[PDB]
Symmetry: D3
Subunit: 173 residues, 6 copies
């Protein structure tokens, strides 16, 4: 089971993320079911948009909304829905939506998976266009869903992101 | 496990379908294995055809052939093999094949997944070309497999389709 | 050459559209070069969005921005960049950008190409979600290019769309 | 222009084919317009089928239906619509539709393009399932367009295929 | 679980292979996790190459490196990562890498899945180009990974391949 | 026609490149025919490799092999075969094959097309893994075509790349 995946091999610097939606995919919003470990279609998205990075969660974590910690993972090629990426957090995008405070971490693959990100220490080391694409996507992807809305607060750095990982791992027990 | 997925949140009007073959996919006929929950390649299809809608089954049901209830689900984008769609049945295509009586339900996504189908109450509310494509596909997709054949009987409406859902759920126990 | 293609077989009710950007495609804004007839990359789009319908122009027409008349064509499957679709206008989206006023027609394939659009005579006969997606796309796709803005004025019907074809055809003479 | 391309470097044994519809593609029936050289959408195909091989024509030939000679080209990977393949005929599928008699050649890439077809000298040297798929495709792909019918007469060998090339080349003079 | 899949319905002539990497896929090297049954991204491959055949392993086997028996499966269309193919071994490619002796079997689908391979009894019955592509891929796919290397020994036939299947099945207990 | 396209808007710093083979594409080596302007299949590549960047040529240039100047263009998304990209050279890969000496430029999109390459002025400003992939690709892609060989001499900077553009432009006069 996915529950047999640890939150990471090494604390917050070295974590696992289970991908629910590949980057640059069809506008199908998948979510993994806790009981099933199965990929559920939560909705077909209203707007003509795609996730700018792979979107998933850290197994064995618990966030404020009761669900695992949300993470976007940047990769050189989109990964398969349901697959698991060893990665490293570099930032945190603060938002609020219809459901309350909702933050998304952003992460890059571990050095064992690729050398492309060795010099990416903070989200500000990612391309500025990609950061703006992530802000813009979350500001607008729910625009055509009645009863859903998003407000962007701002970004925080890698240390805060790792802080949220530790909090969510302990909240899981 | 897939067996931890109920046949639906609400009886026959609101059901879950596990997708084995996405719409418009490569001509690979996948089937989910009961013991494994794993996707098995049952065959590479002989004819140069594709499923006109996503093809799967309702978990926790039992049909006449001993297997779960077959369902085709219409969606705006093909969904991933192995994913689970909350949907609503609108019709039933009656057929017989080498194995005996074989009916396929047809369904559209629940209102929470998309607004595109709110006015689709009966299979006759779907495009006539799509209905004819479904009849034509099942009449011919086995034409190049020795020892396999299909005869189409005809279509029945949404109430009959929901009737078959209830029958298969009770047969599962 | 593309200039050999008339605006239509029959006036404004039966027109041809040369596609530049397929529906549901990667975020590459191609434009056909008037002289070479070759497909140029105008830009990689800044936002994580995709054209909700195929986008192109009517040959041998002239609009106010000095270019042929813009048209979105709804199709059951996205069509190749550079290919030509016989279609019929059903609506017009009014808007203006920084460059001035700018409208896009919306159209559907001629009945010889597909039976699926027989009952679509006005843009309001298309799914409401699609109309909303087209409007949302043009409102936001340029949000990440500095200085660019688009305000939506609203939709107009098929008669108005055909009027704009008549006008743009004569402007090309 | 496409008219600058000869029927072949060497007669009927070494020909060129301009591809209109790639193998394994979406069900869009493209046809190249004689005048503009542009790829037109002739129709969206009614049935849930795909061309089992790349489909196109030999430039500077003339058949009985007043159009260049039709040829299917088997390739290890589907080739782009509008591209040109140096190939060699190995068979001919005889049939007639409502429009009259109609035959398609089948061909394989010249040995300069791939070594994979060295031992394919007759269509019977291709996998039997492919030959059956081509026959099944042309028997059924038009089943959902009213009034259209196709009856298969049978296959003929490479010598007959080369005879039809010789003939169609002279008809174009 | 994948562990509920037998090594095959019938010994070494009729085996199951769980696919980790589809043929002709993105250069993402997936591996199934023993504890999770989940697909892990082991790395993004350095070189600009793709697996020439589907790559997976036989469930319920144990090889020298402690892992299940590696198998490449040739199919007419790439199969989904995580899916299971009933197949039949036809050869064995001997190699050594940074980790020690590493052999890969090669297999074709069982007759129930496709008729395309009935006459393929030995790996030498596969196209010579495909055999050379497999040798070339494994000789070079690690060229841009520091600390990884591969040396090709040579090929062995179907009987040796089935011999390795039996050895690995018994080693699993 | 493609001949109407100048080598660039501005000399060697601002050039156009006509793409023949998109990045990350199937292993089909297309070449544009000088006369017909049509995309020909030159060969199906023997090795299981793909071009790591889009590959094409500068119009209205002449190299030593009697063909226009070869250029690889790095883009955020692969671009369609036959399309034209406004770009800027940043490096040159020196090598020779059996045919003689042969160099490829590497280039990035003009800032009007994308902001992502502002700080890329020399090829050493691209990810090191990409530079290594390009070198590895050209060293090995022809390994399975008998008699063909390529030896890499090394990379040179942007000034040298622009020198080769100046030279090839005058050779075309
Ligand atoms: Mg989440
Ligand atoms: Mg959340
Ligand atoms: Mg949210
Ligand atoms: Mg079934
Ligand atoms: Mg059944
Ligand atoms: Mg059946
Ligand atoms: Mg325009
Ligand atoms: Mg315009
Ligand atoms: Mg505009
Ligand atoms: Mg034809
Ligand atoms: Mg014809
Ligand atoms: Mg015909
Ligand atoms: Mg392995
Ligand atoms: Mg191994
Ligand atoms: Mg190894
Ligand atoms: Mg070249
Ligand atoms: Mg060259
Ligand atoms: Mg060369």
């Amino acid at each position: 089971s996915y529950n047999n995946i640890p939150a990471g091999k090494d604390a917050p610097n070295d974590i696992y993320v289970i991908i629910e939606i590949p980057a640059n995919a069809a506008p199908i919003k998948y979510e993994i079911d806790k009981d099933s470990d199965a990929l559920f279609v939560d909705r077909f998205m209203g707007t003509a948009m795609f996730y700018p990075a792979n979107y998933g969660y850290v197994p064995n974590t618990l966030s404020e909304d009761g669900d695992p910690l949300d993470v976007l993972v940047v990769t050189p090629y989109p990964v398969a829905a349901g697959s698991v990426i060893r990665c490293r957090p570099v930032g945190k995008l603060n938002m609020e939506d219809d459901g309350g405070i909702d933050a998304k971490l952003i992460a890059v693959p571990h050095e064992k998976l690729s050398p492309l990100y060795k010099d990416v220490k903070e989200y500000t080391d990612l391309p500025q266009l990609l950061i703006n694409q992530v802000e813009h996507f979350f500001s607008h992807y729910k625009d055509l869903e009645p009863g859903k809305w998003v407000k962007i607060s701002g970004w925080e750095g890698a240390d805060v992101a790792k802080a949220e990982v530790i909090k969510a791992i302990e909240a899981a027990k």
